[PDB]
Write an enzyme that holds these catalytic residues in place. Sequence first.
Site, mmCIF file in Angstrom:
data_model
loop_
_atom_site.group_PDB
_atom_site.id
_atom_site.type_symbol
_atom_site.label_atom_id
_atom_site.label_comp_id
_atom_site.label_asym_id
_atom_site.label_seq_id
_atom_site.Cartn_x
_atom_site.Cartn_y
_atom_site.Cartn_z
ATOM 1 N N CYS D 152 39.519 36.856 37.596
ATOM 2 C CA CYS D 152 40.213 37.784 38.530
ATOM 3 C C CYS D 152 39.290 38.833 39.151
ATOM 4 O O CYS D 152 39.510 39.172 40.316
ATOM 5 C CB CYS D 152 41.369 38.438 37.803
ATOM 6 S SG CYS D 152 40.798 39.198 36.280
ATOM 7 N N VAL D 156 38.937 39.328 43.239
ATOM 8 C CA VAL D 156 39.263 40.599 43.881
ATOM 9 C C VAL D 156 38.164 41.002 44.856
ATOM 10 O O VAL D 156 38.433 41.411 45.991
ATOM 11 C CB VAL D 156 39.509 41.691 42.823
ATOM 12 C CG1 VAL D 156 39.533 43.060 43.474
ATOM 13 C CG2 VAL D 156 40.813 41.435 42.092
HETATM 14 S S1 CLF Z 1 36.453 39.978 30.680
HETATM 15 FE FE1 CLF Z 1 38.037 40.707 29.229
HETATM 16 S S2 CLF Z 1 39.331 38.891 28.992
HETATM 17 FE FE2 CLF Z 1 38.206 38.562 30.921
HETATM 18 S S3 CLF Z 1 39.706 39.200 32.798
HETATM 19 FE FE3 CLF Z 1 38.090 40.809 32.014
HETATM 20 S S4 CLF Z 1 39.238 42.142 30.542
HETATM 21 FE FE4 CLF Z 1 40.231 40.100 30.694
HETATM 22 FE FE5 CLF Z 1 41.967 38.641 31.561
HETATM 23 S S5 CLF Z 1 43.526 37.549 33.280
HETATM 24 FE FE6 CLF Z 1 42.297 35.622 32.991
HETATM 25 S S6 CLF Z 1 41.194 36.052 31.041
HETATM 26 FE FE7 CLF Z 1 39.856 36.867 32.746
HETATM 27 S S7 CLF Z 1 40.609 35.720 34.560
HETATM 28 FE FE8 CLF Z 1 41.516 38.095 34.362
#
Ligand code: CLF
Lengths: 472, 270, 522, 522
Positions: D152, D156
């Site tokens: 994500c 963005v």
């Molecule tokens: S490094 Fe950590 S786990 Fe990764 S996004 Fe970022 S805070 Fe989260 Fe969250 S929803 Fe899916 S798994 Fe990512 S693509 Fe966004």
Amino acid sequence: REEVESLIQEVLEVYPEKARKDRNKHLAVNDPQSKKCIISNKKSQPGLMTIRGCAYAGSKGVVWGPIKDMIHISHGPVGCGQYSRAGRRNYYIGTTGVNAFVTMNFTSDFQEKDIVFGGDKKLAKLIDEVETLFPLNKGISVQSECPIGLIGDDIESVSKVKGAELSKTIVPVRCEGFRGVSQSLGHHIANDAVRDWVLGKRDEDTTFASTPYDVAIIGDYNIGGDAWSSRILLEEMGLRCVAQWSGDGSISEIELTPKVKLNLVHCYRSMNYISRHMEEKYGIPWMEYNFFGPTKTIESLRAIAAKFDESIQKKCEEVIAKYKPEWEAVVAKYRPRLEGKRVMLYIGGLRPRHVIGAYEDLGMEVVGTGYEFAHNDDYDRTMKEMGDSTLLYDDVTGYEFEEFVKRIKPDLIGSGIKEKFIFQKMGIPFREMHSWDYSGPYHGFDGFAIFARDMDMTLNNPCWKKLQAPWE
Amino acid sequence: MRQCAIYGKGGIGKSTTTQNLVAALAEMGKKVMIVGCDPKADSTRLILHSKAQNTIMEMAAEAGTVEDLELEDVLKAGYGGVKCVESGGPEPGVGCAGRGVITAINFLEEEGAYEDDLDFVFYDVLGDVVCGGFAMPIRENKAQEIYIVCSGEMMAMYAANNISKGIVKYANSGSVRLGGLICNSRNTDREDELIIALANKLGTQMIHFVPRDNVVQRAEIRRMTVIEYDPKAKQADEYRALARKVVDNKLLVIPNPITMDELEELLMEF
Amino acid sequence: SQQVDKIKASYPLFLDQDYKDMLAKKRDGFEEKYPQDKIDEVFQWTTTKEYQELNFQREALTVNPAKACQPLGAVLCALGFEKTMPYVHGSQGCVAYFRSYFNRHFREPVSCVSDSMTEDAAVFGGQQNMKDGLQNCKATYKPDMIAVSTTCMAEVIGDDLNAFINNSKKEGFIPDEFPVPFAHTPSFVGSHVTGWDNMFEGIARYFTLKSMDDKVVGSNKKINIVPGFETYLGNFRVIKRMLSEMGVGYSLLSDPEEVLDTPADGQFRMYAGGTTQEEMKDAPNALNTVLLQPWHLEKTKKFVEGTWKHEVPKLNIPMGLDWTDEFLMKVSEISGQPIPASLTKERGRLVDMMTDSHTWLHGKRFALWGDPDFVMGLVKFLLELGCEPVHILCHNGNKRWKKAVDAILAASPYGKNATVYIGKDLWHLRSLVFTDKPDFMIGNSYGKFIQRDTLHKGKEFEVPLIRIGFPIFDRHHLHRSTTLGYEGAMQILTTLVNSILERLDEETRGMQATDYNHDLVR
Amino acid sequence: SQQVDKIKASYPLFLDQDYKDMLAKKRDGFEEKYPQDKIDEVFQWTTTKEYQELNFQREALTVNPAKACQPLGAVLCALGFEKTMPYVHGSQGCVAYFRSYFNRHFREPVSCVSDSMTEDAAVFGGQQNMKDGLQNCKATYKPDMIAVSTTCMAEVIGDDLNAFINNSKKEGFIPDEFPVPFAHTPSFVGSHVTGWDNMFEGIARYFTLKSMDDKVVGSNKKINIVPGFETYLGNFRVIKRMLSEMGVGYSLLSDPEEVLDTPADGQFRMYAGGTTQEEMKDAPNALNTVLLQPWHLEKTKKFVEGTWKHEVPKLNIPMGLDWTDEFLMKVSEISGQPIPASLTKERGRLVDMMTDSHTWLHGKRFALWGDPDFVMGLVKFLLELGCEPVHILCHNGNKRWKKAVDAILAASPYGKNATVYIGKDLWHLRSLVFTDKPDFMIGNSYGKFIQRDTLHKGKEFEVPLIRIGFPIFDRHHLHRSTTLGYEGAMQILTTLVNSILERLDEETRGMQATDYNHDLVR
Ligand code: CLF
Ligand SMILES: Nc1ncnc2c1ncn2[C@@H]1O[C@H](COP(=O)(O)OP(=O)(O)O)[C@@H](O)[C@H]1O
Ligand code: ICS
Ligand code: CLF
Ligand SMILES: [Be+2]
Ligand SMILES: [Fe+3]
Ligand SMILES: [Fe+3]
Ligand SMILES: [Mg+2]
């Protein structure tokens, strides 16, 4: 009528000559004296897949087995007991292994040396071990199997000696399977066993306080709690049910039975012998009742009340009024899903004619019925209930039943386990009439709702519309 | 190997006639073995010179099954090297002896018993063949030669006819045949009057006749066989004669059982 | 009372207050029941080691056995041949019981006939019963073969099946060439597995004994497989699939998988599949004969070695990992075909599941029971998993089998707490699971009553049951499962690990008491 | 304290008296916990109906969701191709979570790489991250192809995957001919199934867009099969088996069954099986493309219909009886191959099982959740069985899907009490199962926490869970089961009926209370 006769002849044209004449006399077209129409209680033709059992099945599995506080020894090889352990749903209340033993399989487990040298010594030792390991048992019955009858083991002497020595009732039953032609002789032998060893033990005792409203339920084996579903009604009418034979029954109730005022017999075929004996010896009047469906239940309740004073009749009217809306609602809910359907039945000796009124109460017609081991009186009784130009079969075989069903094409078939899957694979809904398809109870007003719901869920299940592959 | 079966009326002298017969075939050159078929096992006493008290049934009960029964513990030698196996059963009035016959014969089939160099296996059956078990010696692959031992008395002849009726079914279903009628005596008026008559009416023959020699009873007292007790007597010569007829018997027709009316007429006919 | 919206069956209808009051009145008035305290004391006494010592001195009484009689196995073996009618010379109540037993286990139609001997037939014999029954059966049901077994009545009275059948053929009741194999199956010796073995030996004798002059070993380039008494259809299927993936020609003798698994398509098929008479006649020509369950195939092994001159391999049942590998290697040696990559992959997959679940499987204590070969295969597989068999029970076992199982246990450090019992029944096992509580039982439906008793002692004393064996009555379609080969090993592994996990989830579902261990990931 | 002979793990060690007293002192002294009566009052309130209207008024808070994000599905789709490395352009935590999720579900290794984009990469872009990541991945793990998805953060900031990959190829970080498909997988739209669809569309567009001139429909006489997001390897196997038994040529695009079920034989395999690049390139030549899960393959359907010019059939998921029949008939119409006798027999066998178990299955009430196609197939099969779906929850469903499921329910009498919920989560389902109690739940492992809650209200209010779906974490080897076809229908039918019978046995195991219904035969 002519079509039924033609089908009977066409089905008969497959058996050899002797088999053909013999099977010709056990098939008839109902015309509402059965001896002039159909003959029953005869030897089955060899090699034709009869459905009947043996005398041991009708004694141990039917009469003595439901007695809960007693220990029943299948005397002989291990097979009989193993196959008959917990196969019948004669419900009871107790602590299995402590004070109730219905679902248990006690056996002598005969070996070769037992046959060659006799098993009376082993029988005495087995009685001793039973008394040691199961102290709260209130009696012992010894159900003979085929080798016991063949080799002439004196189980009566062993029963007498051990009953004297350990001060408990031991009932020897000579129910070896080869006796008779079906379970009917097993019922008879078990009944004389009760008469000779259990029924008259309290003949000289006057300790019991009797009331004018004393009734005994006779021949109800509590399939799925059926007897219970009846007993409540009889108790809501002010009557006191002293004994139940033999579902959830105790040896004390059987001993107390000769003190009742009236004997309500459900299963004629299995208990009429003891009913007549009690009428002739103790002077207790007995009569039949039918609790299958609401109309027969109301008729039976009124008939039962008519044998007593006015208070019982008033309570009967109150009970009928109380239960009227429930069965009216059940009818209004389940009849439209069932009106006009046709049923073919093949059950043992009482149920093919008792369940007809419940079927009619849902707007359903029985076009075929028959018995495994019923006598001529049962057919005399069932001729009035069955409709005109219907089909009657006595000791029907697999081929005959399959061909009859193939040509008649009923909407529902009610019979035993040995043809349930046979008729399931032919696409016709089938409802076990022996174990109630592991459902129930069906007796009484409470059982009528379960009967109607089961009928609907089986007849109208969508699976029956899926037996042809769309590409064929 | 000639597997034979000795049938007939109870008490007519089967194991006696059988034992002296096999003893005469012994010390003649041949090898024989006796197999009894009645719970009160004494069909090998003369050869064994003692009652067995070691039969197939009791040993099977002791071990637990016939599967644990080794063969050498029930087969013994005797006069003239005669093998003897007593198989046994319950005391009178209890159990089922025919099942014992079935089990013991099956055990002798399984454990290699008959497949030795012997000539005749002589099965010897009780007089009261009351069930199919006692008919095991005349099943298929079993004894092929039946020698009905009977005397001139009416009741023995009736028993012989009844036995013939019983063995008709086994004869038709298999290959066992009626070798001949063995005649003992009660010192009656018969001795050809109703023995040859019955034999020819059964389509068979009387294969030699042995009379009421008093020597046989006093040899029985001595645990003895006649040829072993008095090897130079008339009964012993008669027993070699019987052995000789058994050696060269060829008449093996299926029995033809005459009816009760025929027997009743035959009684007055002679 | 009944509400039309929610109709109650026996449960929970009989839990209503009116029914409770009715039962209380009946019990208090006319049943003469013992005081409840007395019942509790007696039940407590039945769970004690003193009661176990009393129970284990039984010499004449059998309570809740774990076996059936020979004609049941004879009928099951007869059903494995094409267009074959099982015909039980004897009484009818027995065939009724056999059919009932097999319908409840398989939920399938089962075909079997009797000649229905009465008291007159017991007194006078069953020859006329034999003739009439054979003629009626052949005319009515039109089999290509009739396989004759016996009930005990017939065995006691010495009914000569061979003579009766020959008399039937000679008097014109049935054609002379119509095949009617027979076997004596006395119920007072052995069990159902012995009846299966005797029936198979009878059929093999009938089709092979007299025509061995023209047979040479290895000419048809096949391997004979004798499955024995088998009530899992997946076992036949997995044996056939493994042999076919191997490229090995085989002849499955007595294969009932089709007749016991017919489709519901509007018609009733009485006969389906089965071994053909041509296969039985050509059986002596095979390279070798493999017995899947050698511990109840003794008479068959004797006949095959003595008559067919086949050097029958000494192979354990192909259950688990090691014994499936030994079976595959032996078949590869006999046939000369190498083990394909698919079988190696499926073995590696089984090993992968083993290493995945070893943590939950290790150290668990099991009681188990069933037929000898099945029991010993289960014991071996449990030993391979790190589990601890504790109570090994086989009512129809013998001393040689017990010695073999003791040798199998002594070869592994997980067998030190294992005792093998033979001749003992499920009441003995109830005592055993009360006195030396295991984690689980593995056995047929009859073990459910043991579970109930344990739960009556308390929740902490309960021993859950795992339904692997015959017969299974209270569950549906478990007869479709597999126990042999790597596939059966994975099915058994999954059932065991998931039973353990389900029990652990049940014990940790309590809110604020034991839910701290109610883990999402296990 | 521990007894060395019987070592207790956390349960039941923390039920010891010392631990109980310690926890009581800790809670009483320093936790400032609410009084217990207040907790019971609040819990009872959450089980009520007023709480249900409060819960269903939610517009911003999502509690216990039943879906994941797009890159998870993208990784799963990438794993289905031969020697393909899933490369997730974005942050490392996403990849770690994806791998942990899939390892917990499959109990198998999962291969995925990230470019480890950091705050500096977030501010300045991931172009250099892309170059170094592609170089290092190709060097270290030697994939035949790298399939690129996004996190994500990357979506963005609008990182151009096409431009970054082309610049990496033009500056020598990777060979120009090395296949590097890409797909934008924004986690803030759709769910995991949407990511699977996007990734498949990207791979297909990469291999087929520019070479459509030399393509003729039906030239290679095969059927393309797109399985979609699938976590039961048995489903891949059953589709392949059913097509092979039909004699139909097929091309299973994105087939991961081999890599997710690798055998354990002492060596580790990063890659095993999968769709080949030649198979992907030849896909437009197929007769037609069949989408097994059409409700999350919209982009794939659009591309296949507009570019390959395939008349993609309107077929539902091959679940249950009717839809498996239709799937077979449509394949038979497309390929010209008749449906064989074996498939007919298997269908009849399923019909036999349904008629055997209809008595117990009828009228049972089920709540159920999962992915759209799986949920709808379950609903159809349950309607075929006579069961009553009551709560149908699909978190990642849409209005058109809800309309289709409502039409399906309206066509049967058994769907009259069924409500379809889209956009709702498992807290909503908890309220639903408290207020309108179903007989059972059908879902993934998260539903266990619902069951616990119900049991806290009482044994009479417990809703047992049946683990069908993704992910299952508290059981083992359930990913090996089957859901599609007649095999999957049989497995689901057996699981349902045995769950019913197990619950009935548990409810009636009470001695002298409810054991009168503890029947041996059911
Ligand atoms: S490094 Fe950590 S786990 Fe990764 S996004 Fe970022 S805070 Fe989260 Fe969250 S929803 Fe899916 S798994 Fe990512 S693509 Fe966004
Ligand atoms: N030829 C004979 N001379 C004198 N006595 C004989 C003769 N044959 C038999 N006996 C006597 O008659 C008895 C018959 O008994 P046994 O041989 O057991 O007959 P079976 O075996 O038929 O019962 C013997 O004890 C024997 O003493
Ligand atoms: S006793 Fe008889 S076969 Fe009258 S042996 Fe049978 S519990 Fe049937 S038709 Mo099973 S004469 Fe009872 C019977 Fe009827 S076991 Fe039950 S259902 S009313
Ligand atoms: S009529 Fe004897 S062990 Fe029991 S099953 Fe039979 S072979 Fe086997 Fe039949 S059921 Fe019994 S034996 Fe007779 S009494 Fe009735
Ligand atoms: Be004698
Ligand atoms: Fe079935
Ligand atoms: Fe794994
Ligand atoms: Mg004698």
